[PDB]
Amino acid sequence: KTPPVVFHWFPFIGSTISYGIDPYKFFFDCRAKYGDIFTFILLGKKTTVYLGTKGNDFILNGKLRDVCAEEVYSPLTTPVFGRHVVYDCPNAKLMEQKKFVKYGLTSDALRSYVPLITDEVESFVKNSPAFQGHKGVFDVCKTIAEITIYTASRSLQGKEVRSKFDSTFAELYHNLDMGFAPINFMLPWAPLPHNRKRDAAQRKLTETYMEIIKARRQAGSKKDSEDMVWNLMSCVYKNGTPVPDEEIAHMMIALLMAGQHSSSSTASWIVLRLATRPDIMEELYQEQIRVLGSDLPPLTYDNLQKLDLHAKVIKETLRLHAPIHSIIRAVKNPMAVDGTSYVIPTSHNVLSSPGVTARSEEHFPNPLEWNPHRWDENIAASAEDDEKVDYGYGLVSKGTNSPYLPFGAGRHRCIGEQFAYLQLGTITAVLVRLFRFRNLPGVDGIPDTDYSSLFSKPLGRSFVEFEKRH
Numbered sequence: 001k002t003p004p005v006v007f008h009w010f011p012f013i014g015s016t017i018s019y020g021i022d023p024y025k026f027f028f029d030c031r032a033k034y035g036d037i038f039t040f041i042l043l044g045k046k047t048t049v050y051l052g053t054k055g056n057d058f059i060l061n062g063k064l065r066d067v068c069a070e071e072v073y074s075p076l077t078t079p080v081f082g083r084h085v086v087y088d089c090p091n092a093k094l095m096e097q098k099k100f101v102k103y104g105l106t107s108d109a110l111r112s113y114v115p116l117i118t119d120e121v122e123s124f125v126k127n128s129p130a131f132q133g134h135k136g137v138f139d140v141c142k143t144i145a146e147i148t149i150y151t152a153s154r155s156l157q158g159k160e161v162r163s164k165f166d167s168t169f170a171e172l173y174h175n176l177d178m179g180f181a182p183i184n185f186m187l188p189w190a191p192l193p194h195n196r197k198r199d200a201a202q203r204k205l206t207e208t209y210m211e212i213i214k215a216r217r218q219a220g221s222k223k224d225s226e227d228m229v230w231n232l233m234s235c236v237y238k239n240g241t242p243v244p245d246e247e248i249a250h251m252m253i254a255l256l257m258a259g260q261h262s263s264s265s266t267a268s269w270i271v272l273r274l275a276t277r278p279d280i281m282e283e284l285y286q287e288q289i290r291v292l293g294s295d296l297p298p299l300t301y302d303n304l305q306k307l308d309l310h311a312k313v314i315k316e317t318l319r320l321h322a323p324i325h326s327i328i329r330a331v332k333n334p335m336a337v338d339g340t341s342y343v344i345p346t347s348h349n350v351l352s353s354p355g356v357t358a359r360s361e362e363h364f365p366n367p368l369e370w371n372p373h374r375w376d377e378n379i380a381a382s383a384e385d386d387e388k389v390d391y392g393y394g395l396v397s398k399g400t401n402s403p404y405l406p407f408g409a410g411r412h413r414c415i416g417e418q419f420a421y422l423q424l425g426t427i428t429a430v431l432v433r434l435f436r437f438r439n440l441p442g443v444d445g446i447p448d449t450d451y452s453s454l455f456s457k458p459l460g461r462s463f464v465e466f467e468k469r470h
């Protein structure tokens with residue numbers, strides 16, 4: 001009834017298994033039979049799926065009274081991030097919170113991050129056992145996750161948090177990260193041992209962050225441009241109340257989780273693709289020689305934006321491997337589709353997957369082929385034509401006519417896109433300077449994508465060859 005119900009075999013499990021294995025293949029098979037609208041039930045709820053640029057526009061630009069993001073996620077995210085932040089509050093408070101973070105991610109702050117990021121990556125390569133010797137292999141996902149957590153903590157989280165990852169922050173975030181698995185999506189409240197560790201880790205992280213805050217106020221000073229010393233001053237809401245340290249702590253935790261899971265996954269895919277394409281890596285290296293010079297001066301916020309192909313590699317990687325595959329909202333009021341007789345009721349969830357349009361033939365010819373040169377049409381870290389609407393933070397292009405929305409659109413769109421492009425590009429440029437990458441003998445292509453966790457990542461333990469240049 002209403003949108004076409006998918007023909008499945010069982011109650012309550014539905015196609016979740018088909019969805020969990022590969023959402024895109026599942027979304028594509030449903031599109032062949034049902035069109036740009038399906039409705040499949042993953043476990044308990046009814047999830048309506050609207051595909052196409054309209055489908056993304058319908059859900060991402062849905063009216064605030066009609067769709068609800070927090071209700072869908074809050075129970076999973078709130079125990080991990082903490083209270084009063086992000087989803088644990090009305091949408092208005094989220095917009096102010098987004099404002100504070102985007103406030104602290106200005107270009108001058110981004111400028112200060114580049115030398116820090118280069119320092120951490122160079123320090124890692126020299127001190128980490130992952131790249132010792134002229135030639136060898138290395139666990140891509142494990143190594144890359146360490147690099148993204150070092151670069152994000154040093155720049156964004158600050159000195160103390162960066163120092164804390166040398167002792168008892170590693171185990172804290174591993175314990176806290178156990179909160180995410182979608183099993184928690186439904187039973188985030190059950191007192192299973194993994195949830196008890198999550199709660200214990202969340203409390204301990206909060207106490208540590210606030211002590212770092214209290215220590216700074218005891219000195220009443222400030223150093224350089226981290227979102228910690230920012231949220232201390234960027235505390236006043238429109239009502240006139242300063243952001244309490246507890247909220248600051250929980251925001252940092254949220255930024256800590258969101259940045260790492262997204263950066264580690266994408267950067268891993270970047271390294272994996274470059275191993276399959278040695279010609280592309282050598283072309284990246286030649287770009288730095290041509291654009292920056294034979295001397296290869298240190299990377300800065302300025303000379304990074306000249307890298308055109310480096311940006312393309314990130315863009316093409318995001319197109320096929322963006323860690324989020326399903327955006328999901330809770331339907332509050334019944335909504336009429338603009339064109340058809342279909343009506344989406346309240347008992348339903350809505351799911352928009354901009355990745356489907358990002359791998360459609362009509363939008364990208366030969367979509368599954370990873371080719372950064374397809375982007376010789378246009379490049380944009382900040383992108384495009386459509387209208388810009390402000391919901392309380394900056395001015396965000398809610399535009400949907402685009403089939404390429406890795407960071408989403410509308411009032412929830414990502415505010416860490418610039419920081420992500422800064423971090424990914426910097427790490428990539430540094431790794432391009434230092435290494436060549438090859439697959440292990442006999443290995444062709446790339447590993448499959450794991451969709452079982454909230455975030456998607458490469459499937460198993462993937463190793464590739466590294467070879468230093470000098």
Ligand code: HEM
Nearest residue numbers: 255258259262323324406407408411412413414415416420
């Ligand atoms: C490639 C890396 C990243 C990807 C692919 C990504 C993806 C996304 C997507 C798809 C959304 C919209 C989801 C929705 O509408 O429900 C989003 C929102 C957001 N992301 Fe990211 N993100 C990335 C990096 C980051 C980073 C580095 C941060 C913080 C430093 C961050 C913080 C956020 C925040 C705060 C939101 C707002 C969510 C909302 O308002 O509902 N993201 N992200």
Ligand SMILES: N#Cc1ccc(COc2ccc(/C=C\c3ccc(C(F)(F)[C@](O)(Cn4cnnn4)c4ccc(F)cc4F)nc3)cc2)cc1
Nearest residue numbers: 016020077086182254255257258259262451452453454455
């Ligand atoms: N068998 C089986 C089986 C397998 C798989 C499935 C289901 O498959 C999936 C896969 C992924 C999901 C995803 C989502 C998801 C998670 C977190 C968030 C977020 F909100 F939390 C986030 O946007 C994350 N983020 C973004 N940018 N940065 N961070 C965020 C926002 C603000 C913030 F400050 C920090 C944040 F990190 N948003 C969306 C859901 C289902 C079912 C069954």
